[PDB]
Design an enzyme around this catalytic site. Structure first.
Site, PDB file in Angstrom:
ATOM      1  CE  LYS A 124       0.180  -4.691  -6.004  1.00  0.00           C
ATOM      2  NZ  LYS A 124       1.558  -5.154  -5.680  1.00  0.00           N
ATOM      3  NE  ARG A 179      11.530  -6.189  -1.426  1.00  0.00           N
ATOM      4  CZ  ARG A 179      10.527  -6.811  -0.822  1.00  0.00           C
ATOM      5  NH1 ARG A 179      10.637  -7.253   0.420  1.00  0.00           N
ATOM      6  NH2 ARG A 179       9.389  -6.999  -1.483  1.00  0.00           N
ATOM      7  NE  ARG A 209       0.826 -10.443  -7.002  1.00  0.00           N
ATOM      8  CZ  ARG A 209       1.385 -10.363  -5.803  1.00  0.00           C
ATOM      9  NH1 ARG A 209       1.172 -11.283  -4.878  1.00  0.00           N
ATOM     10  NH2 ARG A 209       2.179  -9.334  -5.525  1.00  0.00           N
ATOM     11  CB  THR A 219      -2.929  -8.422   0.928  1.00  0.00           C
ATOM     12  OG1 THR A 219      -2.471  -7.902  -0.325  1.00  0.00           O
ATOM     13  CG2 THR A 219      -1.749  -8.587   1.860  1.00  0.00           C
TER      14      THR A 219
HETATM   15  O1  LIG Z   1       2.021  -5.298  -2.596  1.00  0.00           O
HETATM   16  C1  LIG Z   1       0.895  -5.745  -2.420  1.00  0.00           C
HETATM   17  O2  LIG Z   1       0.249  -6.520  -3.257  1.00  0.00           O
HETATM   18  C2  LIG Z   1       0.115  -5.411  -1.132  1.00  0.00           C
HETATM   19  O3  LIG Z   1       0.623  -4.428  -0.434  1.00  0.00           O
HETATM   20  O4  LIG Z   1      -0.889  -6.044  -0.832  1.00  0.00           O
HETATM   21 MG   LIG Z   2       5.147  -6.634  -6.303  1.00  0.00          MG
END
Ligand SMILES: O=C([O-])C(=O)[O-]
Ligand SMILES: [Mg+2]
Ligand SMILES: O=P(O)(O)OC[C@H]1O[C@](O)(COP(=O)(O)O)[C@@H](O)[C@@H]1O
Ligand SMILES: O=C([O-])C(=O)[O-]
Ligand SMILES: O=C([O-])C(=O)[O-]
Ligand SMILES: [Mg+2]
Lengths: 517, 512, 515, 464
Positions: free
Chosen positions: C254, C107, C60, C312
């Site tokens: 995601k 950010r 990744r 995560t």
């Molecule tokens: O951005 C990511 O991969 C998360 O929030 O786990």
């Molecule tokens: Mg990213």
């Protein structure tokens, strides 16, 4: 060997449950499936009615397709005389319900040679002319048959099928006319007097509730009948027509809708919601729809009735050979057992008791088969499924009922004792189909008679006066139920039973797990 | 919707019942075999042709009556009518021949007078059962001769004697070594050579009698496909039948008939020794109480389904059709519930042997069984058969259970199995798929014996074996494609499962 | 017995739990793919080699940081380490490359490794003045989200460092926000910012995302982890950017916010896969509800037969320690028991001090968890919930998995060109490992997204006789399973092939003994 | 809908997962007990009061550290903080006291049990040694583990005997027995407690392979089990702990005995205000496994955010309790329950069944010893069990069972049993109303006796 097929009850699969069914495992004494018997010339005497109650009759069915109002009034008087002949002992007194089966939009032939018992042989390929001329009502023979449905020539066509008696005689319309039909006999036999006629492919335009039916229903309201078996119901408005005729005087008379045709099956859901119960009248149904599809309608209607918690009756030809023989066929024994396994609240006899030569043997055989079949019920799967399909509600009595049935399974209860006024709390227990018998104690004689419609409810009528202290009055009826189960062999001192009462003078909301004495 | 597929998707059996739709037409294929007893009413070649067309799969010959000459003509007529359809192998229906042994039976003598002379037994009368052979052809209301010479050694005062399918009941009051005076309980028209039952007695008659031996050997010479062994009480009885059939008849299946309490009690050892089971409710309904028969039926069918052996539910399934052209509501329900129980085969005995409507009887069994097959809760049955299946490393079992699973996921038109002994097709029928099993074979006996299993539609291939094995398999597979197309089981563009080769190859192929 | 076969035979899930045996060893094969985030601690070819040996299957690349040149070097190192095992096709393990999108991120500014201490109850002003971009302090804070004042309200919560710093919006200025510190701590430079209750107005695919996605098409990446997908139209924008050149590049959406969860069904249908990105998700929704979203998304992905990734902080303590916590060990096992196709490390491998130990730990837990799966109930439910279809491959696939349970197959060998037939087998979750033999290097790499698929890349030339080519590839799978310990000859395996050369579908199932 | 009731109606566990709704709010009541280890960060009366307000039910005293005076004081602060809410019996939450034994510990006959090449671990498994493999910072008097060795230390040492008698004198409600490896070890603990402490519940801590191997003997001999994953994660491979946890939680649910999931559930919250995603999953999955109680040991004793750790466990446990597949769980518990004709078990299972039928707001149980309340919790109802008792010890010990909300009735015994029942039942009504469990018009299940000694009466009554 364990009893009541309890080894099969512990099976984790339905297949293994079948493998464990033991003919040497004796069932319990109590029989949960009600028995409805049609009264006729072979069972009208007070003497026969007494032994029939002793044999296991719970409901006396009066078929208003035959006989006058005086004939039935005598039948009711005899039923009540035989039933009340046991009233001297309230612990052993078995209530008996009275049911009025309507004639309905029936088609019946005429008198053959002038006698109701006379008959005439028919041959295959022969010609029989159907007539509406009222000059042949009692002059029916092997060539001329009189019918009471005047509009038949406007509903049947050339090549249509006409069935007589119980579908045994078949006819095909070869020639039509204004008031006559020339048909060819396909399936010959003995043609009797006033036999039923079915037109499967035709749309009969007869009234669901005729004027005779209205007069017959008012007669039932005046004779204090407990329920009505309404014939040839195919829609909800038909069920309503019966309820309006019963009016305010008969609000508490249960209406049991008889499904005898395709439309009744198609509109079953609306019919079930409007009725108090359902009868799978397989006689006419087996002629209106193909014979191989009847078992589909039976299992469907019994399934939907169990889901809705309303009584369903399986009827007709369950022990047909016992009209002439002292023992049933293997097919007849299986049919009764399978009807109980399907989930039917009541099984019926109509001919095996009304005119047959062995009416007592037919009732006892039904009692024995139902008892064996009730032990073979896969209660493990049945109870959880009934739980999963039960709508969640905040009704305290419904929670008390399912809590009682669950507790009765956990401790293998000898009975579920329910103190009820109208029967509702007792009905809510039977909807979850407990293995233990439901002893419903009531002072209302009508709800005691109507309790036979639900599987497993054993009604007991308390004739003791109402005590001033409510707690004493409750303790009276529970002790009354204790003596009934002891005297009838349901349980003994030291056994465990479930008791359903109220907590304060409304609805049954209290559940007690108590020892018997 | 069709095939009751809306009910087949229900997550509960209660909802599966609620969704049963009388307007949902079943498929053309009918999975449950129909065994028909041949008698005067269906013995002719012309009527036998209509029997096969009506849906008959197995011809049953009751050796409790008739000579060897009589049955040889029956078998000759059965094969003539069956082979009259052989000119078209696509439509040809194999018909098996079954021998029903007499067995340890007890029968009355001939009533005095004519051969058709019957007598009347009135309730509350006395009757002296005798062994004196002087009354063997001189029975009446007062004396009655029996062929059981040891009856005085197993019965006592107070026991019940049944004659004529339990319709006549007797109660013995005083017992002697020669006479047995009894009290008629029910009564009725008593005839000649009527069967007698002793429920509370332990009859010590031989399982395989002298007459049974010559009948079994006669069956071997007549190349019968299976034997129905009456009154099997223990596994040692099954071995005696197998011993008589011997090496010449080692491939003849033995279907053990359970007819008494001892057979039910020892059903496990009987089932293990037999190739199949017949729930013979006739005698069973007299030996044990009638209200307990349905427990024994559902027990035996369940255990046979669990073991993968064929089971037959028999006797009085459509009894009223002997004299009437339509069955009772109880008979239509009895056939359907027998198929819903899991019975591989259903039988007719009198409805086809001597009844006035033998073709109607067969036709009615065909209609009800096909209707009941579609109402089977296949969801629960498959899961339970898989869970309870004994764990094996047999590659053929994994291929068989894979084909049935794949037949459900795609609702295949059929499952085509290529087999020689039939064991491949049998391993598919064990898991009871909804789709028909077109079993292609070149063994004529295998095609006839395949009718014992639910869903196996046997087709006989007479093509010669091709040199290339792939050439031969494709021919047999195409022969099955043309069969299912002609019988209306599937159509072009439909999808079916093919089982070839031990059988280890499974294919999902569209129909060409 | 092994692989928890006594617990697998239980008739209830409770007894299945009661029979879980720590002394029952699992099988050699590990079915759950492992995705590792590459960073400074794992970018060398030497370290990347050990990661492959430890059990890494997918690489990744987090495009929230680093330039195109940095990432291009990473891929070159990944391919160098991966191709170092190419001499033996029997032992060669394909490795995928995944591009994790920057996405609509917010950010903070720059405060030289400087750190500021934020105190609870103090006032922190958030400004958009680019003159404070490089002057971020305890009193004034700058963000790059220039539209923040129009999407947040008074009383809203603002989080500043992976949820560590909490702020409450007290006043809404013309072009600033007056907040009150709730959860103080050390504030760094350019930290991520989350606005849970707000409807962020950032483009789903920004200009940087467009170029980073085009960079992925040119570097021949196998998949895209698309960040902060909130609707089906976002997935389509990603699919259009990948265009014709990257039509076969799998898009993994995601889910990191409430809208993504609320609109999950439309997102799943449009995507090739789903990632439970618990980092941002645990901040956008309350932390106690994350397991609800995780199990829901894993369940719906299992039902649809599409790959799902749990990600995560699965072994977060292993960034600084050589051993995980008991909560971290339980989390990985429960992710596999939930039904996750892949488990991820992101920080435990990119920058932590024990990147190899983290990969081996995921490999060990996933293997143990795979044996404790209640396969009896899972297969029955997947069977009852499988849409009835007349697709010959779907019937063959479910028939193969059923046969593998009936005989405890050592493996299911599938010959596939695009991967579909192998994916169709993996959707029914067999216990036995699926050996997918292919000549396509991309489908070999992309197969790691599906649970149980062991891809092997056949480099032998295509034989003229199709039956010889099939027998070649099947025998290749036999040698692979033998050398890797999946089976020994005499074991039973299922083989999935076609019937004719050019059939166009996998339709043949064979239960054969092992050579 | 609320309480994940749409997911509860699913016919398969897969669909139950597919229906989990983050927007479906949970109920107010939290059924899983919370056990917190008291230490320097949570010993003050002020902090202990807020700890109860956050959701602490059991106070754990780790006798691996500190003298008898330190622990005797800690009990005084706990009881002072607990009794600060005693002025209102409707809002008073009982708090239990638990004694965690030091046990056969090794801290920095060793040379007679190890061999060359054996592994030695120090601290929480952080430092590894081979007779240095995993270096790091070494502290003073840290725990040591010998996985492959058979330590020959006494199950109950002399210090343990003195510590256990000390618990009998301080009136502790339960004992956490560390490093239990056999049934005879559990019996040794019971003998030390003797007749004076017969009613003190012994919770056996499984911390090694032998304890897992001999789990059946330990469960039969103990009153409860703790999955102490700290030492267990070092004695057995870390990747195998979840197998032992799910096994022990399952066997405890089957036997109807309390089980505690403990150690490192929110370990990062010692220094951070928020847990990790793995830690949130761990607590929720422990509740879904079937754990009666969840524990904190460090997150409350020495961490910087002890209150936040208690609230987070309270939030996660409440959320996880709604996600339980009650349909399958209740049916499996029913089918696996030994058949018995005990009216109390029939009354208990009937109440739980009725509570599912009407979605009851609570199950009110009137009990003296707790048995009737324990028998209801074994069938794991969704509704909270409000256990009304006059015995203060059973109120404290009731926290060991999932779902039991104990309330201590201090009202005098009425002469007519019906009045005493009506008094205590209404006391439970005011408690549930004041806590937001139900409101007037809601339906609840009430468990009482029938005569002035088994609980056999169940009433489905509306809330007045
Ligand atoms: O951005 C990511 O991969 C998360 O929030 O786990
Ligand atoms: Mg990213
Ligand atoms: O559809 P898939 O999975 O790509 O399979 C191809 C197998 O035979 P071929 O590879 O020669 O087609
Ligand atoms: O009316 C009836 O009972 C029937 O049709 O069977
Ligand atoms: O001692 C303990 O509680 C542990 O090891 O978790
Ligand atoms: Mg009528």
């Amino acid at each position: 060997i364990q009893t009541q097929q309890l080894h099969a009850a512990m099976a984790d699969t339905f297949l293994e449950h079948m493998c464990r069914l033991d003919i040497d495992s004796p069932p319990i004494t109590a029989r949960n499936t009600g028995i409805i018997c049609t009264i006729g010339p072979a069972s009208r005497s007070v003497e026969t009615l007494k032994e029939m109650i002793k044999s296991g009759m719970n409901v006396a069915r009066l078929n208003f397709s035959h006989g006058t109002h005086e004939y039935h009034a005598e039948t009711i008087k005899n039923v009540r005389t035989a039933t009340e002949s046991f009233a001297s002992d309230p612990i052993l007194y078995r209530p008996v319900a009275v049911a009025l089966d309507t004639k309905g939009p029936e088609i019946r032939t005429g008198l053959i040679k002038g006698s109701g018992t006379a008959e005439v042989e028919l041959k295959k390929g022969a010609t029989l002319k159907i007539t509406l001329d009222n000059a042949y009502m009692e002059k029916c023979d092997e060539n001329i048959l009189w019918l009471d449905y005047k509009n038949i020539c406007k509903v049947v066509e050339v090549g249509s099928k006409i069935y007589v008696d119980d579908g045994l005689i078949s006819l095909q319309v070869k020639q039509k006319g204004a008031d006559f039909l020339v048909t060819e006999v396909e399936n010959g036999g003995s043609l009797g007097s006033k036999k039923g006629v079915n037109l499967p492919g035709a749309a009969v335009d007869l009234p669901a509730v005729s004027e005779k039916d209205i007069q017959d229903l008012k007669f039932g309201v005046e004779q204090d009948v407990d329920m009505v078996f309404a014939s040839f119901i195919r829609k909800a408005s038909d069920v309503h027509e019966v309820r309006k005729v019963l009016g305010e005087k008969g609000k508490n008379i249960k209406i049991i809708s008889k499904i005898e045709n395709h439309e009744g099956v198609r509109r079953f859901d609306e019919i079930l919601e409007a009725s108090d119960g359902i009868m799978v009248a397989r006689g006419d149904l087996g002629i209106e729809i193909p014979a191989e599809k009847v078992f589909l309608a039976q299992k469907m209607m019994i399934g939907r009735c169990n889901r809705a918690g309303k009584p369903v009756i399986c009827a007709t030809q369950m022990l047909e050979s016992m009209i002439k023989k002292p023992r049933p066929t293997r097919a007849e024994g299986s049919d009764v057992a399978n009807a109980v396994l399907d989930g039917a609240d009541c099984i019926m006899l109509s001919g095996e008791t009304a005119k047959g030569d062995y009416p007592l043997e037919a009732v006892r055989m039904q009692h024995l088969i139902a008892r064996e079949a009730e032990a073979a019920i896969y209660h493990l799967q049945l109870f959880e499924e009934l739980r999963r399909l039960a709508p969640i509600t905040s009704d305290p009595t419904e929670a008390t009922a399912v809590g009682a049935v669950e507790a009765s399974f956990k401790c293998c209860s000898g009975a579920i004792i329910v103190l009820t006024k109208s029967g509702r709390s007792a009905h809510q227990v039977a909807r979850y189909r407990p293995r233990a018998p439901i002893i419903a104690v009531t002072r209302n004689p009508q709800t005691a008679r109507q309790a036979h419609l639900y599987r497993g409810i054993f009604p007991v009528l308390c004739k003791d006066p109402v005590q001033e202290a409510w707690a004493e009055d409750v303790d009276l009826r529970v002790n009354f139920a204790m003596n009934v189960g002891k005297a009838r062999g349901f349980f003994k001192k030291g056994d465990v039973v479930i008791v359903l009462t109220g907590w304060c003078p409304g609805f049954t909301n209290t559940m007690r797990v108590v020892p018997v004495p």
